[model samples]
Target: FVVPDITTRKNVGLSHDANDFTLPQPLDRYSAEDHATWATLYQRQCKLLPGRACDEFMEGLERLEVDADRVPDFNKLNQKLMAATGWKIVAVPGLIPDDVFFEHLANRRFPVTWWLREPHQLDYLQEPDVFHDLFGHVPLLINPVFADYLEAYGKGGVKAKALGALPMLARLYWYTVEFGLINTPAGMRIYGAGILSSKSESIYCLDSASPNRVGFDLMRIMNTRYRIDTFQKTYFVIDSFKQLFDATAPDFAPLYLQLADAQPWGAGDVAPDDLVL
Candidate 1:
C-alpha cells in the first residue's frame, strides 16, 4: 500500500546510469489520476505563489508554457528550457546519490523524480514527487544568473567530494537553493525551490516571524545545519542571483579545510557576524 513512497521504499523499476542516476522521463507512465494530482497541486501553488515567489520564477513558468492542466511532457518542456538557459531535465526514480546529483547539475542537467504523489498523500509526502522536482526547481532554471549559480554549485560539488566536504557544500544548497530568500527592492521574496513549491512554506517563509532572515554569507551558510521535516529555523537572504554566483566563485578547497574541524551552527542560531534583518 505504502510501497509507492519514495522515502520509505526504493527501486521504482527504473534503470540508472553510472554518470548519474538519470533516465529518460517515462512519458507514458502517468495516469489520469496523476494528471489530476498535478493540476490540483499546480492550481494551489499558482494561487499562493504571487508576491512570495521571485519574479523570475513566475516568468519562467509562463515562458516554458508549463501546462496547468496536466503533468508536462519532459521533451516539450526541455525545448524551451534548453533554449533559454542551456539546461535540460532528466528523470530519475527518486532521490539519488549526492555525487550523481552533483554531476548532473554540473553538466546543466536537472534530475527530477518520475512519479506523482498518491492522491491520498497530497498534502504531505516525505519524498520529492514530480511536482516538487518540476514546479519547485525547474522554473528557476530559466533565469540566467540563477542557472549559472546552480551549474557552479554542481562543479563545486565535485571538488567538495574529493576533499570530503560534501556535507558543507550540501548545506550551502539546502540553505540557498532549497530554502533561500532574496532581498528585492519590494521586500523579501522566495527564490528557493523548497519554499516555492510548498503551500505552507510559501506563506511561512515570508509571513511568519519565526525564522531568522539573515544576509547571505557563503561560509556561514556552509557551516549551518538544516531540518528536513519542518519549516526552516533560518532563511538566508541574497541580494541578487549575481551575488550568489560571485560568492561561490572563489575556490572552496581552503575554506573547506579551514572549517574542517570547526563546529557547525544550529539551524536556528544567528552567527555573531550575520547581517540580520
Candidate 2:
C-alpha cells in the first residue's frame, strides 16, 4: 500500500477543499521521463486494443483528443468531455475515501490521481496513477448510456451508505465499472477500465478460457466478490449499456436488505442461476 513519491509529493502550494479532495492539475510535477512513459504506455495499448477493446473506448480517445505524448491537461480534456457528456475530470493526490469517490461520480466529476508510474513499472502498478485513471476510465464516460449509469451508481452509493450496505455497492462498482465486459456484435469486448488499461488483462480476459464469463445480473454481480491482487476469476458481460442503465432504475433499497441474509458467491463460483457462457 505504499504510494509512490510522485504521488506523495506536495503540490504547487495548491489546496483542495476538505469535502471534495480535488485540486488543480500539477503540470510541473511531471519530469521528461514521465512524458516518455506516457507515450510508451499509450502506444503499447494502442497496438493491443484495436480488436480487444470496445469500439467506443477507442473512439472516445479520438473524440476527446486525449494526449498520447504526455499526461493530459485535465482542463483541456474537460472542455471536450463536458460538451459531450456533461462529465469533467478533477485532480486528486492518490486514493481517496469511498464517499468522496461516490460524490464525484454522482455529480459527473471524475477524480484522477496526478502521477505516472515509474519507468520500471511499465508492465504494472499496484495502485492507480494518472494513466490508469485517465486513459482507462475517461474514454467510456463519453458513451451516453454508460455515462448515465455511472451517475446513477453514485447516487445509489449514497443510499447504500445510509443502509449500511456499502460493501454491496462497492462490489457492484468493482464488478461492473472496473472489470465489466460487454457482449458486442464482433465478440466479447473489453470495456472495463481495469482491463482496458493493461495489455495482459485485455488479452487474458477474452482469449483465456480460465475465467468465468457470465451475464451481467445486477444483484448477482453485487453479491460477487472481486480480487485486487490478481486477475478476476469471473467477468460479467452486459448485452448493452442500456441493460446496465435500465437495471439501475429499479431501486435496490429492498435488495440491500434482501441480500443481507444471502450468502455471497466467491470470486470464481458460477451461481446456480448464472447465465454462464
Candidate 3:
C-alpha cells in the first residue's frame, strides 16, 4: 500500500530472526532532513496535544525524556522504558506479520518502523512510520495497566488465531489502541495512538460531533469494523486503563464462536447494546 519516495530510507544491513522481525535501529542512516522532520512533527503535536491528550501519555513522554529535537535513539529510549514498564522498542522495516507482531508484544517488545515520512507526506501516510509508532503509541507504554493490557492482548492473539478470530481481535485493537478515548474528570481525552499521532484527527476525534463516542463494551467492539484510510467513524470511551485491562480477563473462546455466525456492525453503525456517550 506504500509508494516509496526518494526521501524514504531503509535499513538493509541487518538480518531478521524467526520469532521477531527486528533489526538494529540504523541510527546513522538518519540525515539532517530526517531530524528536521522529526522536530517539526514533534513541535506541531506537542502544541496540539495539551487539552486533547490524556495525562498518562503526556507524563510518560516527560518521564522518559523522549527527544523532541530529533528522532530518538532506540537504545537510549529503552533505558527509561525498560525501567518503567519492562518494555522496549525494536526497529522494523515497516509493518510485519500479525503473528510476529503478537509475539513481540507478548514478550514486551514493540516493533517500530525505522523510517520517517518525507515532508511532502506529513499530513497522511497509508502505513505507519517511526513518528506514528513512537510518538503516538510508545509513551502510553509506561502506564502499568495499559502495558499489561497490551501483553494480554498479545497473548490472546494465539487463541484468536486458533479459532479463526483475528478479525474480531483486530477490531478490539482498532477501537481501543488505535482510536480510543478516555472520560477523565476534566473531559474526554484521547489515548489512542492513531488519533494521537495525526494533526487533524487530534482535533476531530474529540471536537467533532459527527462520530459516535460510545462507552467501551468488549463484545460490541469486537463485532464492529473500522476504517484505515480515514478518520474513525466512532471512538470508544473507557473509564480507566484498569477497565480496559479487566475487560480482557474473560476467556474469549466462547465469545469468538458466538460471534462467528453473527454479522459484523459497520464502522459507523451503532449497536443496540452500545452505551453511547
Candidate 4:
C-alpha cells in the first residue's frame, strides 16, 4: 500500500460524509506496536517539553489525558475538548484544500491526519501524521482564548483568499500557529505546533543562537517567508494568547495593501528590523 509508485493513490483523498466529522473515532486501527510507538513518542516529548513548551500546552495535555498508551480516540478527546473550548478533532486522509482547512478551523474543527508514520519515518514526517497533528497541536486547543484565535484565523483566511492576501494569512499561520514562540517569565517557550512536535526544533528554537527572535509584528510576519524543509531562521514571539486574538481582530486590508510592494524575507535571512539574539 505504501510503494513509492503507489504513493499518490495510496494516500489520495477519499469520499467522506460531512457527518463523519462528528462521528465516533474507530479505535480498531491501533496495533500493539502502534501503541508502543505512541507511548515512546509521548514520553520523549513530555520529558523534553517542560520549560520548552508553554504552560497552557503542558496543562492541556494532562487535562485532556491525551492518551499515552495509544492513539487517542478523537470522539473521546472531543468529549473533553467540546466541553472546554468548543473544539473537536476530525480525521482526514492528508492535507486538504486551504479553504476546507480554514472552514473547519473557523468552526473550531481541527483536522488530524489519521495515519501514523512508518517506523522508518519515525523521527519526522514530511506530511502531517498523527504524531505531528495530534501531539503537537490538539493539546492547546483546550484553551478557549487559543481556540478563539484559531477560529478567527480561519475567518481571516476567507478574507485573505478573497483579497489575494492568502500569502499574508499563510505567514500569520506560519509565524503563530505553526512556529511562533512566547516569552515566559523564565524564558522563551514553545507555542507553535511545528516546533512542539519536533524534538530538535523544540530545543533549538530556545537554546540556539543562530535564529532571530522577533516581536510578533503581524505585518512583519505577513510579509516574511518561512522554510518548510529545515529549521526556521526566525521565530515570531507573542507576549500572550490574548495578543494573538486582539492583534488579528482588525481588518488586514490596509496592512495587506501596505505590504503588497515590500520584498519578502527569505527562508533563512533575517529582516533588518528583526531582533537578533
- Estimate TM-scores for all models: 0.95, 0.95, 0.96, 0.91
Off by over 4 Å in 2: 1-6, 9-15
Model 3, which residues run further than 4 Å from truth?
A: 1-15
Show where candidate 4 strays beyond 4 Å. 1-14, 17-26, 275-277
lDDT string for model 4 (1-277, tens) is 7556222443444444554332234456557877788888888899899888999999999999899988888888889999998888998766777878888988889988776776666688777778889999999998988999999998887877788888888888988999989998888889999999886899889998888888888777888898788999889898899999998778898898888888887777767777654
Q: Order the candidates by lDDT, highest first.
A: 3, 2, 1, 4
TM-score computed on alpha carbons, candidate 2: 0.95
> Least lDDT summed over 10 consecutive residues: which range in candidate 3?
4-13
Q: Candidate 3 local accuracy as lDDT?
A: 0.90
Compared with the true structure, what per-residue lDDT tens digits does model 2 show for residues 76-138? 999999999999999997888889989999999899988889899899987898889999999
Full-model lDDT for every candidate? 0.89, 0.89, 0.90, 0.83
What TM-score does structure 4 among the candidates reach?
0.91
Pitting candidate 2 against candidate 4, the one with the higher lDDT is 2
State which candidate, 2 or 4, has the greater TM-score: 2
RMSD of each: 1.8, 1.9, 1.9, 2.7
TM-score-best of 1 and 4: 1
- Model 2 pairs in collision: none
The positional error of residue 85 in candidate 3, measured at the CA in angstroms, is 1.2
Query: What overall lDDT, based on C-alpha atoms, would model 4 receive against the true structure?
Result: 0.83
